[PDB]
């Protein structure tokens, strides 16, 4: 398993504009288009993102391209972030994927706000950190996914995703 396979399990693949768990317009493999309520604003963003007239629909190909960009951006965002970088550098390869997943779902900003958990991960206090992460809107709103990510940080192995 790798970051791409992991995220593709968590996000799924939809070739038609759809709404977030959050009610937001998305397409592909969790690519948020807009937080705005118009399907029209969403369509516009889509076409801007793909460079063609899509009429709300994309190919698999286009979906993976957006996915490649999103993952690349997430990693580079971590690397540029004063709060995120040190944790990332301290982690092993599997846990690194868990942090990446959080950043992709919630943005640099949101994750960098998990101050106390970040601290604990840096310290390698796996069980404590798993308990702390769970005390969040994130976990209450998307419990199955949060629990997979949390197990990944806890164990450092890919079993949470084996099932899936």
PDB file of C-alpha atoms in Angstrom:
ATOM      1  CA  UNK A   1       0.000   0.000   0.000  1.00  0.00           C
ATOM      2  CA  UNK A   2       1.017   3.594  -0.749  1.00  0.00           C
ATOM      3  CA  UNK A   3      -0.403   7.108  -0.327  1.00  0.00           C
ATOM      4  CA  UNK A   4      -2.321   6.955  -3.565  1.00  0.00           C
ATOM      5  CA  UNK A   5      -4.001   3.624  -2.811  1.00  0.00           C
ATOM      6  CA  UNK A   6      -4.753   4.763   0.701  1.00  0.00           C
ATOM      7  CA  UNK A   7      -6.393   7.983  -0.398  1.00  0.00           C
ATOM      8  CA  UNK A   8      -8.242   6.374  -3.174  1.00  0.00           C
ATOM      9  CA  UNK A   9      -9.896   4.029  -0.601  1.00  0.00           C
ATOM     10  CA  UNK A  10     -10.808   6.999   1.588  1.00  0.00           C
ATOM     11  CA  UNK A  11     -12.090   9.346  -1.075  1.00  0.00           C
ATOM     12  CA  UNK A  12     -13.459   7.075  -3.789  1.00  0.00           C
ATOM     13  CA  UNK A  13     -13.745   7.973  -7.496  1.00  0.00           C
ATOM     14  CA  UNK A  14     -16.659   9.947  -9.046  1.00  0.00           C
ATOM     15  CA  UNK A  15     -16.592  11.235 -12.559  1.00  0.00           C
ATOM     16  CA  UNK A  16     -19.564  13.543 -12.055  1.00  0.00           C
ATOM     17  CA  UNK A  17     -19.679  16.686  -9.859  1.00  0.00           C
ATOM     18  CA  UNK A  18     -20.874  15.605  -6.451  1.00  0.00           C
ATOM     19  CA  UNK A  19     -21.273  17.021  -2.876  1.00  0.00           C
ATOM     20  CA  UNK A  20     -18.792  16.547   0.085  1.00  0.00           C
ATOM     21  CA  UNK A  21     -19.658  14.911   3.257  1.00  0.00           C
ATOM     22  CA  UNK A  22     -19.727  18.611   3.909  1.00  0.00           C
ATOM     23  CA  UNK A  23     -22.173  19.513   1.236  1.00  0.00           C
ATOM     24  CA  UNK A  24     -19.425  20.871  -0.999  1.00  0.00           C
ATOM     25  CA  UNK A  25     -19.039  20.478  -4.693  1.00  0.00           C
ATOM     26  CA  UNK A  26     -16.264  17.984  -5.548  1.00  0.00           C
ATOM     27  CA  UNK A  27     -15.240  15.740  -8.396  1.00  0.00           C
ATOM     28  CA  UNK A  28     -12.691  12.918  -9.000  1.00  0.00           C
ATOM     29  CA  UNK A  29     -10.770  11.581  -6.030  1.00  0.00           C
ATOM     30  CA  UNK A  30     -11.825  14.115  -3.406  1.00  0.00           C
ATOM     31  CA  UNK A  31     -10.921  17.182  -5.425  1.00  0.00           C
ATOM     32  CA  UNK A  32     -12.891  20.075  -3.824  1.00  0.00           C
ATOM     33  CA  UNK A  33     -14.015  22.493  -6.496  1.00  0.00           C
ATOM     34  CA  UNK A  34     -15.734  25.275  -4.529  1.00  0.00           C
ATOM     35  CA  UNK A  35     -17.324  25.942  -1.131  1.00  0.00           C
ATOM     36  CA  UNK A  36     -20.026  28.031  -2.881  1.00  0.00           C
ATOM     37  CA  UNK A  37     -23.525  26.911  -3.332  1.00  0.00           C
ATOM     38  CA  UNK A  38     -23.848  27.282  -7.092  1.00  0.00           C
ATOM     39  CA  UNK A  39     -23.467  24.337  -9.250  1.00  0.00           C
ATOM     40  CA  UNK A  40     -22.610  27.006 -11.687  1.00  0.00           C
ATOM     41  CA  UNK A  41     -19.615  28.309  -9.723  1.00  0.00           C
ATOM     42  CA  UNK A  42     -18.535  24.644  -9.443  1.00  0.00           C
ATOM     43  CA  UNK A  43     -18.788  24.018 -13.145  1.00  0.00           C
ATOM     44  CA  UNK A  44     -16.702  27.054 -13.826  1.00  0.00           C
ATOM     45  CA  UNK A  45     -14.008  26.000 -11.449  1.00  0.00           C
ATOM     46  CA  UNK A  46     -14.025  22.559 -12.999  1.00  0.00           C
ATOM     47  CA  UNK A  47     -13.513  23.806 -16.483  1.00  0.00           C
ATOM     48  CA  UNK A  48     -10.783  26.118 -15.179  1.00  0.00           C
ATOM     49  CA  UNK A  49      -9.108  23.156 -13.462  1.00  0.00           C
ATOM     50  CA  UNK A  50      -9.192  20.838 -16.520  1.00  0.00           C
ATOM     51  CA  UNK A  51      -8.735  23.367 -19.321  1.00  0.00           C
ATOM     52  CA  UNK A  52     -11.808  22.320 -21.252  1.00  0.00           C
ATOM     53  CA  UNK A  53     -15.501  22.512 -21.314  1.00  0.00           C
ATOM     54  CA  UNK A  54     -16.504  19.674 -19.176  1.00  0.00           C
ATOM     55  CA  UNK A  55     -20.162  20.257 -18.550  1.00  0.00           C
ATOM     56  CA  UNK A  56     -19.734  18.729 -15.020  1.00  0.00           C
ATOM     57  CA  UNK A  57     -18.166  15.545 -16.207  1.00  0.00           C
ATOM     58  CA  UNK A  58     -14.525  14.322 -16.420  1.00  0.00           C
ATOM     59  CA  UNK A  59     -12.631  11.168 -17.543  1.00  0.00           C
ATOM     60  CA  UNK A  60     -10.683   8.772 -15.311  1.00  0.00           C
ATOM     61  CA  UNK A  61      -7.571  10.175 -16.748  1.00  0.00           C
ATOM     62  CA  UNK A  62      -8.437  13.738 -15.788  1.00  0.00           C
ATOM     63  CA  UNK A  63      -9.417  12.481 -12.352  1.00  0.00           C
ATOM     64  CA  UNK A  64      -6.027  10.932 -11.741  1.00  0.00           C
ATOM     65  CA  UNK A  65      -4.265  13.999 -13.013  1.00  0.00           C
ATOM     66  CA  UNK A  66      -6.016  16.195 -10.481  1.00  0.00           C
ATOM     67  CA  UNK A  67      -5.170  13.500  -7.915  1.00  0.00           C
ATOM     68  CA  UNK A  68      -1.462  13.587  -8.726  1.00  0.00           C
ATOM     69  CA  UNK A  69      -1.491  17.409  -8.355  1.00  0.00           C
ATOM     70  CA  UNK A  70      -3.398  17.264  -5.070  1.00  0.00           C
ATOM     71  CA  UNK A  71      -1.097  14.730  -3.479  1.00  0.00           C
ATOM     72  CA  UNK A  72       2.022  16.673  -4.673  1.00  0.00           C
ATOM     73  CA  UNK A  73       0.567  19.898  -3.241  1.00  0.00           C
ATOM     74  CA  UNK A  74      -0.239  18.242   0.092  1.00  0.00           C
ATOM     75  CA  UNK A  75       3.336  16.943   0.550  1.00  0.00           C
ATOM     76  CA  UNK A  76       4.879  20.331  -0.487  1.00  0.00           C
ATOM     77  CA  UNK A  77       2.522  22.015   1.805  1.00  0.00           C
ATOM     78  CA  UNK A  78       3.675  19.896   4.745  1.00  0.00           C
ATOM     79  CA  UNK A  79       7.335  20.553   3.796  1.00  0.00           C
ATOM     80  CA  UNK A  80       6.780  24.374   3.752  1.00  0.00           C
ATOM     81  CA  UNK A  81       4.853  24.480   6.978  1.00  0.00           C
ATOM     82  CA  UNK A  82       6.826  25.403  10.092  1.00  0.00           C
ATOM     83  CA  UNK A  83       4.539  23.378  12.263  1.00  0.00           C
ATOM     84  CA  UNK A  84       4.106  20.356   9.977  1.00  0.00           C
ATOM     85  CA  UNK A  85       7.590  19.804   8.637  1.00  0.00           C
ATOM     86  CA  UNK A  86       9.233  18.786  11.945  1.00  0.00           C
ATOM     87  CA  UNK A  87       6.554  16.231  12.690  1.00  0.00           C
ATOM     88  CA  UNK A  88       6.762  14.789   9.146  1.00  0.00           C
ATOM     89  CA  UNK A  89      10.523  14.525   9.291  1.00  0.00           C
ATOM     90  CA  UNK A  90      10.304  12.728  12.617  1.00  0.00           C
ATOM     91  CA  UNK A  91       7.886  10.097  11.356  1.00  0.00           C
ATOM     92  CA  UNK A  92       8.414   6.671   9.681  1.00  0.00           C
ATOM     93  CA  UNK A  93       7.152   5.971   6.154  1.00  0.00           C
ATOM     94  CA  UNK A  94       3.760   4.564   7.072  1.00  0.00           C
ATOM     95  CA  UNK A  95       2.866   7.313   9.607  1.00  0.00           C
ATOM     96  CA  UNK A  96       3.999   9.885   7.094  1.00  0.00           C
ATOM     97  CA  UNK A  97       1.160   8.656   4.883  1.00  0.00           C
ATOM     98  CA  UNK A  98      -1.308   9.202   7.723  1.00  0.00           C
ATOM     99  CA  UNK A  99      -0.304  12.842   8.093  1.00  0.00           C
ATOM    100  CA  UNK A 100      -0.530  13.332   4.367  1.00  0.00           C
ATOM    101  CA  UNK A 101      -4.104  11.922   4.382  1.00  0.00           C
ATOM    102  CA  UNK A 102      -5.137  14.433   7.053  1.00  0.00           C
ATOM    103  CA  UNK A 103      -3.644  17.341   5.130  1.00  0.00           C
ATOM    104  CA  UNK A 104      -5.387  16.287   1.933  1.00  0.00           C
ATOM    105  CA  UNK A 105      -8.775  16.124   3.712  1.00  0.00           C
ATOM    106  CA  UNK A 106      -8.532  19.104   5.901  1.00  0.00           C
ATOM    107  CA  UNK A 107      -5.761  21.375   4.572  1.00  0.00           C
ATOM    108  CA  UNK A 108      -2.395  22.419   6.129  1.00  0.00           C
ATOM    109  CA  UNK A 109      -4.150  24.921   8.204  1.00  0.00           C
ATOM    110  CA  UNK A 110      -6.665  22.667   9.770  1.00  0.00           C
ATOM    111  CA  UNK A 111      -4.092  20.033  10.659  1.00  0.00           C
ATOM    112  CA  UNK A 112      -1.583  22.504  11.981  1.00  0.00           C
ATOM    113  CA  UNK A 113      -4.261  23.394  14.498  1.00  0.00           C
ATOM    114  CA  UNK A 114      -4.032  19.980  16.094  1.00  0.00           C
ATOM    115  CA  UNK A 115      -1.213  21.308  18.268  1.00  0.00           C
ATOM    116  CA  UNK A 116      -1.377  18.790  21.111  1.00  0.00           C
ATOM    117  CA  UNK A 117      -1.611  15.676  18.902  1.00  0.00           C
ATOM    118  CA  UNK A 118       1.235  16.972  16.723  1.00  0.00           C
ATOM    119  CA  UNK A 119       3.395  17.244  19.844  1.00  0.00           C
ATOM    120  CA  UNK A 120       2.547  13.722  20.911  1.00  0.00           C
ATOM    121  CA  UNK A 121       3.267  12.289  17.459  1.00  0.00           C
ATOM    122  CA  UNK A 122       6.631  13.988  17.502  1.00  0.00           C
ATOM    123  CA  UNK A 123       7.262  12.412  20.831  1.00  0.00           C
ATOM    124  CA  UNK A 124       6.255   8.926  19.509  1.00  0.00           C
ATOM    125  CA  UNK A 125       3.540   8.573  22.098  1.00  0.00           C
ATOM    126  CA  UNK A 126       1.328   6.645  19.731  1.00  0.00           C
ATOM    127  CA  UNK A 127      -1.448   5.656  22.049  1.00  0.00           C
ATOM    128  CA  UNK A 128      -1.775   9.079  23.637  1.00  0.00           C
ATOM    129  CA  UNK A 129      -1.900  10.793  20.363  1.00  0.00           C
ATOM    130  CA  UNK A 130      -4.616   8.411  19.018  1.00  0.00           C
ATOM    131  CA  UNK A 131      -6.748   9.220  22.048  1.00  0.00           C
ATOM    132  CA  UNK A 132      -6.221  13.039  21.499  1.00  0.00           C
ATOM    133  CA  UNK A 133      -6.885  12.995  17.693  1.00  0.00           C
ATOM    134  CA  UNK A 134     -10.287  11.357  18.375  1.00  0.00           C
ATOM    135  CA  UNK A 135     -11.465  14.317  20.369  1.00  0.00           C
ATOM    136  CA  UNK A 136     -12.212  16.390  17.297  1.00  0.00           C
ATOM    137  CA  UNK A 137     -14.995  17.479  14.997  1.00  0.00           C
ATOM    138  CA  UNK A 138     -13.040  15.524  12.318  1.00  0.00           C
ATOM    139  CA  UNK A 139     -13.581  12.196  14.186  1.00  0.00           C
ATOM    140  CA  UNK A 140     -17.198  12.886  15.083  1.00  0.00           C
ATOM    141  CA  UNK A 141     -18.108  13.924  11.472  1.00  0.00           C
ATOM    142  CA  UNK A 142     -16.222  11.120   9.584  1.00  0.00           C
ATOM    143  CA  UNK A 143     -15.629   8.445  12.163  1.00  0.00           C
ATOM    144  CA  UNK A 144     -14.793   5.433   9.860  1.00  0.00           C
ATOM    145  CA  UNK A 145     -12.160   7.269   7.910  1.00  0.00           C
ATOM    146  CA  UNK A 146     -10.756   9.063  11.031  1.00  0.00           C
ATOM    147  CA  UNK A 147     -10.484   5.722  12.715  1.00  0.00           C
ATOM    148  CA  UNK A 148      -8.524   4.204   9.849  1.00  0.00           C
ATOM    149  CA  UNK A 149      -6.085   7.125   9.913  1.00  0.00           C
ATOM    150  CA  UNK A 150      -5.828   7.040  13.660  1.00  0.00           C
ATOM    151  CA  UNK A 151      -5.087   3.296  13.669  1.00  0.00           C
ATOM    152  CA  UNK A 152      -2.398   3.938  11.093  1.00  0.00           C
ATOM    153  CA  UNK A 153      -0.716   6.505  13.417  1.00  0.00           C
ATOM    154  CA  UNK A 154      -1.192   4.125  16.355  1.00  0.00           C
ATOM    155  CA  UNK A 155       0.294   1.000  14.737  1.00  0.00           C
ATOM    156  CA  UNK A 156       2.583   2.094  12.016  1.00  0.00           C
ATOM    157  CA  UNK A 157       1.250  -0.751   9.780  1.00  0.00           C
ATOM    158  CA  UNK A 158      -1.395  -0.889   7.047  1.00  0.00           C
ATOM    159  CA  UNK A 159      -3.951  -3.255   8.546  1.00  0.00           C
ATOM    160  CA  UNK A 160      -6.767  -0.649   8.773  1.00  0.00           C
ATOM    161  CA  UNK A 161      -6.722  -0.566   5.016  1.00  0.00           C
ATOM    162  CA  UNK A 162      -6.388  -4.370   4.498  1.00  0.00           C
ATOM    163  CA  UNK A 163      -9.842  -4.908   5.313  1.00  0.00           C
ATOM    164  CA  UNK A 164     -10.853  -2.274   2.798  1.00  0.00           C
TER     165      UNK A 164
END
